Design a protein around this nucleic acid. Structure first.
Lengths: 309, 305, 309, 305
DNA sequence: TATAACTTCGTATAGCATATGCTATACGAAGTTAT
DNA sequence: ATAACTTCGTATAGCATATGCTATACGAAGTTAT
DNA sequence: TATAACTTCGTATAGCATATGCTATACGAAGTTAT
DNA sequence: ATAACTTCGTATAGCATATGCTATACGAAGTTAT
C-alpha cells in the first residue's frame, strides 16, 4: 500500500471529529513517546516494526508504568496502523505475547488498578454541615456541585456540560436535569435548594443557554458563559479543596487518590446504595456503568457466623 | 454486469410486496432528494460514490436534520446499493467517518429527541366537561375517540381500522374491542355509544367505528374507506386549539403517553405499562414517565432519609 | 467447485451424527418435496436455481402451508448448499425478497402460529382426582408421567430419556431427577409418591440402567428396557387419552391442539407460575427457555380501573 | 516460509512467561500424546492434517475421555498451529464435524461432570471431635487446615501460600487473613493457634503457616518452600480414610462445596455465596447447592400449596 | 385369535442457543529425604 | 367560499430483528405379546 | 500590583459500549368533495 | 523399610475473556479580572 496509506491517514484527520478530543490527545501522545523511543534507538517509527514495538512495550514496563498504560500505547499504535491500511503491531506474535507476558508479571508481582477515594453520604453531610453557612459565592457553588455529583453520579465532564435550559422541574418542586434524547436526573429536595441557592447567587439563569457552573473570581463574582465551561480540571479542584478543607494537606508520597476526585461521588454513591439494599442493576444504571464488575470493585461473619453458633 | 444490477431492480420491483408502501415511499423519497442534490452539484447519483455521499450527508447536517433522519437517508442509499451488486456507501471509510462525526458533533450541539405532549386524565376530564353536553355530531365522535384512545392506549392506525363488529360486551355495559384485545371503562363505553347511534354505523357491522362528518353535522358511515390516521391526529390537534387556541399541541400518541404517566402515578408495574401500549425498550415507556416523581431514583430516595 | 462438492457432501454423511436425527429427517423431507416439485416442472433440483427456489416457495405458500413451514424448506435447502460448498438460495434477491414477501402477506392476512392447549394445575388436580383411584398399571404410569410433565416442564423427549439411575432423592424425601453435567429437577412430595407408586408397580428399578417410563401391554404388565424408550409419540398419547378421558372425542375439524400434547404441561405450568407471581426469568429457566417472548405468548382494568374511579 | 513458523516458535519460547507453567505442561502433554499417536499410526504430527486429527479425536473418544478433555486436546493442537502461520485443525470442516458429533454422541451416552464430595459442618464436627484431643503434631496441623478451608472457603494453592504474617487480629481473638481478605471464626481461630505453637512457625514471620511434618511428629517450618497443593489434598483424603477406611473421598475443594451448602440451608443470599469462594456462573454455586431442599423451585413450592 | 398399546414414518410447524482457552484442581504414582 | 377531509412528501420516533438447528404435532401404517 | 482561581497541556491510567432497518407516526400543505 | 512428602503426567473442572475508545488524575505552566 502506498499513496493509499497517505490517503487513509488523510481521511482520518479530515473527519477527525468522529473521535473524542481525548482519543486524539492520546494518539499524538503515545506517538511522541513511540517516536522518542525509536529515535533514541535508531529506528523507523512508522510503520512500526513488531520487534521494535515489543522492545518498546518492555521499555515502558521497565519504566514502571501501569499495565493499563502499556496497553494504551500498544492500542494507539494499533489504532494508527489499522486506520491507515497497514497491519497492526498486535498482529504479530512478538507484540501479542509480550503484552500478555507484561500483563502477567505485573499482576503476578501485585500491581493493581488504583481506586478513587469515596465521597459518601456522611462526607456530603459534613461538607454540607460546614459550608452550608457560607455566603461566599465560591462555597455556595462548590456545595451545590458536590451535591449534584453525589446525587446524580454524573461524570465531572457531564456536569460541566449542563446548561440552564437543560433544567426541568417536577411537580414535586424537585429539580431535574437532562444529560445529552438522553437521560433525566432528578435532584432531591435538599440538593435542589443547594443548586437553587447557587443559581440565585450567580445569575447564570440570566441566559438559558449559559452553563450552570461557571468560574467565580477572587472577588466573589460569577462569570457565566454559554460558550465556555468550567474546566473539568477545576471540577476536580472543588473535590480536592473540599477535602483539604476537612483533612488538610496531602502526604507528599505523590500517589493518586489521597484526596477526592472526579470518581469520588460516583464510587461513594455506589456504596451507600449498596449498604441501603439497592439492587445491583439499579446501581449500575444510575452510575451509567454497563458492567457489574465496575460497581462491584467500588463495593468491597458469613461463614464466621454459621460456625460461631 | 450491468445486467447483473438490472436483474436486481427487476427482482426488487417484482417482489415489492416484501415491503410496506410506507417503507417504499420513504425510499423513493430519499432517492428523490439525493438525485436532486446530485443534479444540482453535478455528481453521478447511481452508483453513489462515497465522497459524493459524504458530501451529501454533510449537506443534510446543515439542513438541520436530526441524526435519525440523516441515517434514514444514508440507510436507504445503503439498501438499494446492496440490493444491486454495488458496494454500500457505508462500506467506504469516508462515509463511515462522517456518519460518526455528524453524530457526536450533533449530540454535542444539543440533539434532543422530540417530546410528545401528553394527554392525561386531567386533560380528558377538561375536554369531557367542555363538550360533554354537546349535540354536534362531530364533538360526539371526537370525544368517543379521545376516549377509546386514552383507554385502549391503541395506536391511531389501529383505531382507524376498528369496525362495528370488533366490539364485544363484557361487564355492566362496557364493550370490548377485538384487535390486530381491548377493554373499555364504563365511562368511555357510555361515550362510544352516543357516537354509534347519532352516526348509525350500527346500521352495518362492516362499517368502521369511526367515520367522516361533513360540515353539516352529518356522518358518512362506511365499511370501504376508513378515517385517515391524519384525521385522527387532527382531532387531537383541534381539541387542543379548542382549549388553548392556535410537538406544541397533541398528536396521535399523546393519549398513549398520558395514560402511561397517569398510571405511573397511581404506581403501576412498569411491565404492566407494556400491556398498555404493547411496548419494548422498558426505557421508551421510561422516556415518557421519566420526569414523574415516583421515577426519581433510589438516590433521591436515600438522600431524603 | 466439483469433486469438492461431492466430497463436502461426503464428509457430512460420515459425521452425520453431529446433527440431530430430526435435522436429517427434515433435510431428506424437504429434499423430497423440492425434488418432487422440480420433477413435475422439468427442473434440476441440485444445485438449486434461485428463480426455481422462489417458484417453489410461492408454490408452498399457495399450497397453504405455514410461514414457519415455508421457512423450513428454504432453510434445509440453504443447509444443503452451504454444507456442500455452493452458494445458498437465500443468497439471491429473488429467494430472500420472496420469503419476506411471503411472510408479510400471510401475517398481513392474519395467519399466526398456533399455540398448544394448556394443561394447568387445575387440570392436573382433576386428572389426579380421577385416576388417583386406579390400580391399573397403565393409569398409575400415566398419572405419574403427567405429574412429572407438569412439575418439571421437561420436553416429552427429555422425560422419555430419564433413566432410573438418574434419580437422586433429597434430605426431604423429595425425588430428584438429572437431565443430561446437566440440570437437577426436584419433584414435590405429592408427585414423588405418584412416581414412587409407578416405580413399585412396574419394577423398572430392577435395573438402574432401565428407562423410568416403559410400555405397558394390554394385560397390565410393564415392559422395562434400558435400550429402548417409550416413543415420544406415546408420551403424546398419554396426553391425548387423558384429555379424551375427561372431555371426550375431538371435533373433526382436524386442527391441532384440540387436546393436550407435549407442550401442554410446559405452557400450563408457565401460567400458574405467572398468576402466582413467580418472576419471569424464574419461569424461563424452569421451562428451559432462553427468551422472554416464548414465556410471554404462553401467558396472555389496568386503565379500565383508573378511569372507573 | 518454514522460517516463518520457525520465527514463531522462537517468539513462543522467548515470551513463554506469557503463560502459566501449568498451561505449558498441559500443552507439552498434549503434543506428547498426539505425537505418540502419530508415530504409532504413521502420520505426520506437524503440521497436523485435519483427517489425521479427526482420527485422533475419534481415538480419544474411545479412550473414554470426557468432552472437556478431548476439547483440551483439540484446543492445544489449535493453539500452536495458530501461533505458527498454520491453519488450525478446527478450521477444517472434518474436525469441526467430529468435535460436534463426539459431543452429542457423548452426552447421549450419558456424560456427567464429576461431583465433588462435600465436606460440610457435620463432617467438620465429626473430625473435630475425633482428633480434637490429639497430641500428634500432624493431627493438630490437619485440623487447623480443615478449619481454615471450611471457614475461609479458600482454594488449596491459596492456603499453601499463607505465611505467618498474612494474619491480622480483629475480634475477641479470631485472626484475619490477608490474601491474593479472610476472617476466621473463633472456634477455628482457637485451632490455628495450637498448630502455630506446636510448630513454631511463629519463630519466623516469613515461614508459611502450613508446613511439613516428618514421620517423627516433628514440624519443619520454612519460608522458602511451601506445602504442595497435593499434600493439602492428601489431608482431605487421609482424613476421610480415617473415618470411612480405604470423587469417592474428599479433595482440595470439598470444603468449599460443603460451606456453600451448609450456608444455603441457613438460607443465604446466593450472591452472598459468591463472597464465599469468589465465584461467577451463579450456576456453578448452584451445581453445588442443587439437590438442596431450599433449591427445589417454585414449581415444588406451588404444588405443595 | 382379535386387540390393546405401541413403534415407526412422513409431512407440517413450533421453540431455542449462538464459545474457547487459560489456569486451577484431581488423583494415581513414580521419585526423594529424613526417620 | 369553506368545512372536513384525503393524499403527499419528508421528518423523525418505536419496535424487533437472522440463522441455523432441533424438537413437537398427529394421522396413519406396521408390529407384538397377549 | 500581587493573586486568587482558573485554563490549558502533557503524561499516566481508569471505565465502557459493542446496530440497523423496517414501519409507524408527525405535521405542513397541496388536493378534493359535498355543503 | 517407610512415613510424609514432592514432582510428574494427564484428566477434567471453574472462571473471565478482546477491542476500540473515551474519560478521569494531577502537577505544572500560562492567563485575567481584580
Amino acid at each position: 500500500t502506498s499513496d493509499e496509506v497517505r490517503k487513509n491517514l488523510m481521511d482520518m484527520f479530515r473527519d477527525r471529529q468522529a473521535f473524542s478530543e481525548h482519543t486524539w490527545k492520546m494518539l499524538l501522545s503515545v506517538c511522541r513517546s513511540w517516536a522518542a523511543w525509536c529515535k533514541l534507538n535508531n529506528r523507523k517509527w512508522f510503520p512500526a516494526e513488531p520487534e521494535d514495538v515489543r522492545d518498546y512495550l518492555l521499555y515502558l514496563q521497565a519504566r514502571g508504568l501501569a499495565v493499563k498504560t502499556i496497553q494504551q500505547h500498544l492500542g494507539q499504535l494499533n489504532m494508527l496502523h489499522r486506520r491507515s491500511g497497514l497491519p497492526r503491531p498486535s498482529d504479530s506474535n512478538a507484540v501479542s505475547l509480550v503484552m500478555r507476558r507484561i500483563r502477567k508479571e505485573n499482576v503476578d508481582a501485585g500491581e493493581r488498578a488504583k481506586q478513587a477515594l469515596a465521597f459518601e453520604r456522611t462526607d456530603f453531610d459534613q461538607v454540607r454541615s460546614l459550608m452550608e453557612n457560607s455566603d461566599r459565592c465560591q462555597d455556595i457553588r462548590n456545595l451545590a456541585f458536590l451535591g449534584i455529583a453525589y446525587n446524580t453520579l454524573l461524570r465531572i465532564a457531564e456536569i460541566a456540560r449542563i446548561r440552564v435550559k437543560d433544567i426541568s422541574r417536577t411537580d414535586g418542586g424537585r429539580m431535574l436535569i437532562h444529560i445529552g434524547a438522553g437521560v433525566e436526573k432528578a435532584l432531591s429536595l435538599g440538593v435542589t435548594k443547594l443548586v437553587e441557592r447557587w443559581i440565585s447567587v450567580s445569575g447564570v439563569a440570566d441566559d438559558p443557554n449559559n452553563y450552570l457552573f461557571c468560574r467565580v473570581r477572587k472577588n466573589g463574582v460569577a462569570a457565566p458563559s454559554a460558550t465556555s465551561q468550567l474546566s473539568t480540571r477545576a471540577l476536580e479542584g472543588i473535590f480536592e479543596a473540599t477535602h483539604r478543607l476537612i483533612y488538610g494537606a496531602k502526604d507528599d508520597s505523590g500517589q493518586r487518590y489521597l484526596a477526592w476526585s472526579g470518581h469520588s461521588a460516583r464510587v461513594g454513591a455506589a456504596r451507600d446504595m449498596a449498604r441501603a439494599g439497592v439492587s445491583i442493576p439499579e446501581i449500575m444504571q444510575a452510575g451509567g456503568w454497563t458492567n457489574v464488575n465496575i460497581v462491584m470493585n467500588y463495593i468491597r461473619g458469613a461463614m464466621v457466623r454459621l460456625l460461631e453458633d
